[PDB]
């Protein structure tokens, strides 16, 4: 009795659509150390609970197509944005790392590439979201968007990303 | 190459070495195989497609498996790949079909048997009594209690 549901940043991962399979790709950091990373290859759609944040994510291979969060604050959906984010394995996120040169590094062996990189953006996600990108919104089915100074905008939003009330 | 695939997952050997020798083995099923056997201490690394394990092995018998995998299916592939490479004597005498697969060599005509299902391959491996990783018994349930011999699974 193995649940297919998963955790990652603090936030249960549970899968409602898709599929993938694992690929091992080299990924060149903002730090300009070279990882390897497993790629999760395909389309999914996952729903993330956490305490204070939930979060619907839809992506393809490297790439956010979709983020809907809800949460009790701006700071709780702050940090589910920061795990997507991460989770999303987009290049954009992995130049985004500045300094920890032997935490975000091959040749740490304590922990893995991609919990490397979510422990480095939960200490601080002021780059990665300044180097995430933006784009206007539709405000419609009542949601609403998030700049990267983690200011809401009826206009605009981080790529992908949409608040929606709890 | 210390590289190969089996049972799609590649295989890297990370320490220790290996002669082969041609071994009979009697099946579960009553006929004889001929295998090439392994012979030697060997540490292994899985990555497959679905799940990574790390595998340590002697001459015919599974020391350690640590396996990692997000659901049932892919932690049992992995386990059932690696008890297979093995060779045990206690996974050969589990097989309970015809090993007519297209004609396929005597280790990939037991790894398709077992990948069919892997009851009887996991009731007759054995448990044993068992910091972070956890056991996993024949009918796939975690448990901090025991575990089938040798294997673990952890988030790696």
Redesign the interface.
Same mark, same amino acid.
Do not use: G
């Given at each position: %009795?193995?649940?297919?549901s998963?955790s990652f940043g603090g936030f249960t991962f549970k899968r409602t659509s898709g599929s993938s399979?694992? %690929?091992?790709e080299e990924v060149l950091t903002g730090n300009l150390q070279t990882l390897k990373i %497993?790629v999760h290859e395909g389309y999914e759609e996952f729903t993330m609970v956490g305490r204070r944040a939930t979060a619907i994510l839809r992506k393809a291979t490297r790439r956010l197509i979709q983020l809907i969060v809800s949460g009790r604050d701006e700071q709780s959906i702050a940090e589910a944005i920061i795990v997507a984010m991460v989770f999303s394995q987009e290049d954009c996120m992995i130049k985004a790392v500045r300094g920890d040169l032997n935490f975000v590094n091959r040749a740490n062996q304590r922990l893995?590439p991609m919990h490397q990189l979510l422990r480095h953006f939960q200490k601080d996600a002021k780059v990665l979201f300044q180097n995430w990108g933006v784009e206007p919104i539709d405000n419609v089915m009542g949601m609403i968007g998030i700049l990267p100074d983690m200011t809401p905008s009826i206009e605009m939003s981080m790529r992908g990303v949409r608040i929606s009330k709890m």
């Open positions: %009795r193995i649940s297919s998963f399979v694992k %690929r091992e %497993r893995n």
